[PDB]
Amino acid sequence: GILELAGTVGCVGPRTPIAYMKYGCFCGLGGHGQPRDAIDWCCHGHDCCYTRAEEAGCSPKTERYSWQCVNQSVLCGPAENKCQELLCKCDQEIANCLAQTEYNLKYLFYPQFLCEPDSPKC
Ligand SMILES: Cc1cc(-c2cc(C(N)=O)n[nH]2)c(C)s1
Numbered sequence: 001g002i003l004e005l006a007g008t009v010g011c012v013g014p015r016t017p018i019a020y021m022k023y024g025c026f027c028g029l030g031g032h033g034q035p036r037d038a039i040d041w042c043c044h045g046h047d048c049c050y051t052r053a054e055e056a057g058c059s060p061k062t063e064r065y066s067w068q069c070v071n072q073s074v075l076c077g078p079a080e081n082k083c084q085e086l087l088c089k090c091d092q093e094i095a096n097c098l099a100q101t102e103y104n105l106k107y108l109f110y111p112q113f114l115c116e117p118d119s120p121k122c
């Protein structure tokens, strides 16, 4: 869920999870368009993963799961079921993705009217 998403992103990356709450065309609730940069690509990929998790019968925004932060890296487990392992994979992946990127301040609170109606495929 969101609690573990916050946790994993701060474990691996150098910045507040607040930095990703309305950013580019994809970072935050929903999203459409051409991704503005690497960070926005990370969020498009996470959007896709969560979509996949939902199609598999999971609730990626609410379901709790255990994990450990060891040397600023995410270890998933123990998992009680398949959904917990999918969810932790999705959050691990975005966390690793975002930790490798430079932040572009200009994309924080970017106008949605500049985001195209079509998106890249998942
Ligand atoms: C608390 C956090 C939310 C997000 C987030 C991801 C997305 C997304 N994939 O659109 N939106 N907010 C982080 C990276 S930490």
Ligand SMILES: [Ca+2]
Pocket: 026, 027, 028, 029, 030, 031, 043, 047
């Ligand atoms: Ca999104």
